[PDB]
Amino acid sequence: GKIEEGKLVIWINGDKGYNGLAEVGKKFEKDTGIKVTVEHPDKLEEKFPQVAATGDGPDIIFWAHDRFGGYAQSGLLAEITPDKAFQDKLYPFTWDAVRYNGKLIAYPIAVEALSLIYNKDLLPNPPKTWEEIPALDKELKAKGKSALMFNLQEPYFTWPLIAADGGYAFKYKYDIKDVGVDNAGAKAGLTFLVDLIKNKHMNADTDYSIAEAAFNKGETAMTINGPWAWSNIDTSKVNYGVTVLPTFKGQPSKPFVGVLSAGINAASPNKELAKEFLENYLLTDEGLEAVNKDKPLGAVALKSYEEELAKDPRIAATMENAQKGEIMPNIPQMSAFWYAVRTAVINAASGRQTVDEALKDAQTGSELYRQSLEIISRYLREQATGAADTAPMGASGATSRKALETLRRVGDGVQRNHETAFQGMLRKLDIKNEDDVKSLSRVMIHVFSDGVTNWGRIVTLISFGAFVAKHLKTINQESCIEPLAESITDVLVRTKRDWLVKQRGWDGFVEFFHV
Ligand SMILES: Cc1c(C(=O)O)n2c3ccc(Cl)c(c13)-c1c(nn(C)c1C)CSCc1cc(n(C)n1)CCc1cc(c3ccc(F)cc3c1)OCCC2
């Protein structure tokens, strides 16, 4: 329940230099008498938000920057306030990756991008194009080898191909309502991947460990991986090169670029020890060297140590691929986007869904929070004030508009028919201000998560929200309505994600209540 005072617990992914990080921990302990424990739990990026929401978890969490906006929005991260002298030691774009709602929410460590890694003894020159890989595989199969193996279980690895011909996550300012997962470009890329599998150039079951072992044993000519993998390749004594990813339809593969970052748990009683560790032990030439020697970091954020490593052709390749890619967003939706696309790739690769079916579901999943919030926020606000929002609905606007019209019909009926239960519960909850609204999340999840799933219960959730919003406006707390709508939306989408996607999201709602 409570994080222990007077020690540091650190979480980092099991593909990174955790033994090197522990060496930096030992240096810290030698100066201070404070013990540093480094752990690498499975699925730590999913475990962290669950444990931290209870006041528990590590003091420090390491992950790429994309997950940290979600954590910060949830109240799970301490604000970082390094002085100017410290801030100036790192590249400004790395600080930009860890800024959320104008606040620094983590320390940046290193820039990561995927590259094409190839065995010079099998393929002296790497392929410039994806399109030439089937013919290379045919050549290599006659030598008892194969052209390419990489992790097909994590969408981070397949994304560069999906993005190449025009797939995108959130259109870039970001337009969060503009998602590019089921467009022609995304379909072309994923169809190419699925055709590789159909034609027996790759196996849908290949994962990180299987691809790594095949490459490092000299069984496959190429893999796709990041700087952290280079240690194990060095140990293997494969004659490898690191290069630009192949093009698709003449266009570069576009890796999603990550900034490995270190956040401090909002519930830690060791925030000063954590800052001291991160600024004066880790983010130093010697600290980063200890970690980099274990598993390479990429292009480190620290100007002084990055200058020394920049002459490495493997780093040059990493940065070439990075320049062709895009820095990941850190918006809270990123977790949902990754879950949606992970499922789409796995299902398309296995034959569970067609490419069209798979990307349609991924588009729905990625759009779900924003579309749900549009509908709910508009209903609550128009209920409270008596007047509709004149602003355009935007992307998938017909669905939003029709869902709002449906909700007007069925939601107004629920508020009439359940006036007695609603008035009774409103009085018992005694909702007075924004603090009271913030306290609703836990109880709403409890009530709504229990029992059957159907559209009627979704209507009850939203309709009581409108009932509360009317109350809030009347008592001059209209500023609480948008936070209420965000809280309800979060409950809805977190608890019913898979069911909602199965219904075709809000189009299911509209069809369910037609006539
Ligand atoms: C049956 C019922 C359901 C359902 O089928 O799931 N929902 C209700 C929402 C409101 C009401 Cl009044 C009732 C329900 C209710 C009750 N009797 N009848 C006859 C009805 C119709 C009271 S028993 C259920 C209950 C409600 C609460 N608790 C602790 N328990 C208060 C905690 C709370 C809960 C919410 C909120 C949604 C928006 C919001 F701004 C604040 C919220 C606060 O939503 C829960 C999910 C929707």
Ligand SMILES: OC[C@H]1O[C@H](O[C@H]2[C@H](O)[C@@H](O)[C@@H](O)O[C@@H]2CO)[C@H](O)[C@@H](O)[C@@H]1O
């Ligand atoms: O596959 C989705 C996954 O992508 C990224 O995770 C990377 C991570 O950035 C790399 O440092 C390395 O560990 O490989 C991971 C892929 O297995 C995102 O950072 C992550 O949030 C997302 O779920």
